[PDB]
Design a protein around this ligand. Sequence first.
Ligand SMILES: *[C@@H]1O[C@H](CO)[C@@H](O)[C@H](O)[C@H]1NC(C)=O
Ligand SMILES: *[C@@H]1O[C@H](CO)[C@@H](O)[C@H](O)[C@H]1NC(C)=O
Lengths: 49, 38
Amino acid sequence: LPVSMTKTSVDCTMYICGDSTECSNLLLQYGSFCTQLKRALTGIAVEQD
Amino acid sequence: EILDITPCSFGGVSVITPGTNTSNQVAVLYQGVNCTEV
Ligand SMILES: *[C@@H]1O[C@H](CO)[C@@H](O)[C@H](O)[C@H]1NC(C)=O
Ligand SMILES: *[C@@H]1O[C@H](CO)[C@@H](O)[C@H](O)[C@H]1NC(C)=O
């Protein structure tokens, strides 16, 4: 029976932009889209432990 | 001559704080990097 998973953390600025500074100014125009993802990933990581 | 490239040093930065009510001392934690690199 599986009880745990892989604690995966996804960086939005490294996944979407990666190495572009011009696109980094456009991510702040959408609001807290990255905050919800980071909070969900942190919650999953805490739930696994 | 073939030169192998490697991405820059990056990772998650987490601040280990015991709460602002007790003390203001904090500790940084650089995830996924060695101590020889900043
Ligand atoms: C610390 O917690 C106590 C009890 O909850 C509270 O009375 C006090 O105001 C808090 N201190 C700060 C700086 O928030
Ligand atoms: C950091 O570098 C040292 C020296 O090469 C190595 O022994 C150690 O395993 C490295 N740390 C990690 C987490 O791999």
